[PDB]
Ligand binder design. Structure first.
Ligand SMILES: NC(=O)c1ccc[n+]([C@@H]2O[C@H](COP(=O)([O-])OP(=O)(O)OC[C@H]3O[C@@H](n4cnc5c(N)ncnc54)[C@H](OP(=O)(O)O)[C@@H]3O)[C@@H](O)[C@H]2O)c1
Ligand SMILES: NC(=O)c1ccc[n+]([C@@H]2O[C@H](COP(=O)([O-])OP(=O)(O)OC[C@H]3O[C@@H](n4cnc5c(N)ncnc54)[C@H](OP(=O)(O)O)[C@@H]3O)[C@@H](O)[C@H]2O)c1
Ligand SMILES: N[C@@H](Cc1ccc(O)cc1)C(=O)O
Ligand SMILES: N[C@@H](Cc1ccc(O)cc1)C(=O)O
Ligand SMILES: [Cl-]
Ligand SMILES: [Cl-]
Ligand SMILES: [Mg+2]
Ligand SMILES: [Mg+2]
Ligand SMILES: [Mg+2]
Ligand SMILES: [Mg+2]
Ligand SMILES: [Mg+2]
Ligand SMILES: [Mg+2]
Ligand SMILES: [Mg+2]
Ligand SMILES: [Mg+2]
Lengths: 293, 293
């Protein structure tokens, strides 16, 4: 079943460890090499049996690796690329899984040598949990993964990465990085930002107690709390590195909310009914597509 | 197991039909009487076996009923109270399940006679689906229900309604209707309004296609689409009937979002990290309480 003789995983949290478990289950690698920055996380990965070889040095980890998967918060991407650059073998494929792509490409590509193939990726799959114990086999089954190869990228390298993600159970699409960043700003980043904002709002109230919010959360609030429990480093970094697309979507959202607020202020039941009717269609399409939870 | 000789259910959608199924499973009624406004819904309720007696007339339905449960969109509450008032027996208990309470009390109480007991309720439990086929036994298990009896309400009537909800598996709290409406504005109404708004925003884009939004919805958007698939009549009515509390929470939310937008604009990573850290605590409390989905 092997697709790569050696796969090096740099970062071994939710995504990296889920990839590790799938590689083991599908026998996709001759050798899995695991690296992460801390001794504590590396030890956990060892106790979990996520790799065959382990190291604290990303430079050492990539020596002789055919595929290098970088699964770290996006603001760390450049530092990883700088540390591994000199140690990559000719023809290595370097990929990532970052939630932003334009930034990652800009941060990493200046460090990477001409003889390696850089094929950025993004699996459209996750949970609110983090670290190696949070990962599991099958996270990517029936999900989409987006690749964003720069112009002139080796087409065989792209095909091998497409096959890899398909083997993990994903459907694969390719797009330009700027388009990726616009699409993800609305389908992912804005939803998280808005969830953080509403949970912060509720926390700040004096008249309604924390106990009340918790007790009665099954009337809608709980759904937003799940997203707002995600890792703060990950989401800090997305906001810092997809700024322009996020700000565009926030401005659209806030224009629309002013109009909805005015319909509520003026008791415009017909406008409210029309908005609430229009939104149902999207859910029905998601359900028919099998993308619902 | 009987708690009431005759229970009349006015409205037989998600909530009314879930109550009907629980009454049957727990043997809580001598007779279940079902009424709803349309022949189509009444026929469905009959095919499902939700009642013992069926009628299109709410006035007829309540004749001799010990407990009358009104489960209709909140803007219909007054019309129901007006139709049944003259037909209620002395000592009947009239309750409702509306998502707002101040409005329901104001609309219903002027019609109801001095000899009946009015004990408004709200089960903090539901799904995004509607109608009799959407209901199920066990919807209320491990959920909260809030009662909002006006001052001077018969304490034995309140106790019987508390016992009824406890038997359906709920924990029961009592509060003032205005406080209810403030609490629900943040834990339920604002979350739904914001979900409708974000799904509307995404729908309006030209650069990102409907197909893209659907395909990549597992990156966060799908959670909001579930709420925005709810019944438009129900949610139109909540916005019309909890206006003041909703507008207060919308203004708090929008003040907070301006500040978050400014942190993103200025690249204030430390502020973002602090907000995203603070919100995790609420989720952990919900999980420990067992209120998570
Ligand atoms: N979570 C999701 O749902 C999801 C989905 C798709 C894509 N992604 C993207 O996947 C990437 C990884 O996310 P994740 O959820 O797997 O995160 P995670 O569970 O928090 O794992 C983070 C990993 O990155 C390491 N790390 C953290 N800061 C680092 C730094 N400054 N330099 C080097 N390594 C560092 C951690 O090592 P130590 O523990 O040893 O410090 C750990 O190995 C992110 O770019 C995220 O945007 C996430
Ligand atoms: N859905 C939830 O999650 C949830 C949770 C807690 C509380 N509630 C509250 O429960 C109440 C009922 O909600 P639901 O979800 O059960 O709704 P639903 O499934 O849409 O059922 C609506 C019921 O009300 C009837 N109805 C509609 N408009 C009416 C009118 N103008 N006059 C008289 N009857 C009318 C319908 O009869 P026909 O079908 O014959 O027209 C049907 O029997 C609402 O006040 C809602 O706010 C809902
Ligand atoms: N973590 C998100 C999903 C997600 C997927 C991809 C991302 O890039 C970000 C988030 C959730 O639990 O729903
Ligand atoms: N229908 C909501 C829950 C809810 C509960 C009580 C309400 O009054 C309103 C909504 C959901 O599916 O999550
Ligand atoms: Cl190979
Ligand atoms: Cl009785
Ligand atoms: Mg070196
Ligand atoms: Mg070299
Ligand atoms: Mg260099
Ligand atoms: Mg608009
Ligand atoms: Mg009459
Ligand atoms: Mg009378
Ligand atoms: Mg009268
Ligand atoms: Mg504030």
């Amino acid at each position: 079943a092997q697709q790569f003789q050696t796969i090096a995983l740099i970062g071994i949290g939710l995504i990296g460890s889920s990839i590790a478990r799938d590689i083991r289950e599908k026998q996709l690698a001759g050798t899995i090499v695991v690296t992460t920055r801390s001794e504590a996380t590396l030890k956990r990965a060892g106790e979990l049996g996520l790799g065959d070889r382990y190291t604290l040095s990303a430079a050492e980890a990539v020596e002789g690796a055919d595929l290098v998967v970088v699964s770290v918060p996006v603001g760390a991407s450049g530092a990883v690329a700088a540390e591994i650059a000199a140690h990559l073998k000719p023809g290595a494929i370097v990929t990532d899984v970052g939630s932003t792509k334009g930034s990652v490409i800009a941060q990493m590509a200046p460090h990477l040598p001409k003889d390696v193939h850089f094929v950025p990726g993004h699996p459209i799959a996750g949970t609110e949990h983090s670290g190696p114990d949070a990962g599991f086999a099958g996270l990517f089954r029936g999900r989409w993964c987006i690749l964003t190869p720069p112009a002139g990228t080796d087409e065989e390298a792209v095909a091998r990465l497409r096959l890899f993600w398909e083997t993990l159970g994903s459907m694969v699409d390719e797009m330009d990085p700027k388009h990726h960043d616009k699409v993800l700003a609305i389908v992912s980043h804005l939803p998280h930002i808005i969830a953080y904002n509403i949970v912060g709002t509720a926390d700040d109230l004096e008249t309604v107690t924390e106990s009340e919010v918790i007790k009665y959360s099954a009337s809608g609030f709980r759904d937003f709390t799940r997203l707002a429990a995600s890792d703060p480093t990950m989401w800090r970094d997305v906001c810092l590195h997809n700024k322009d697309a996020i700000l565009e979507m926030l401005a659209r959202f806030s224009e629309d909310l002013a109009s909805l607020q005015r319909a509520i202020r003026w008791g415009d039941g017909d406008k409210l009914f029309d908005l609430f009717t229009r939104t149902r269609a999207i859910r029905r399409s998601i359900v028919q597509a099998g993308q619902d939870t």
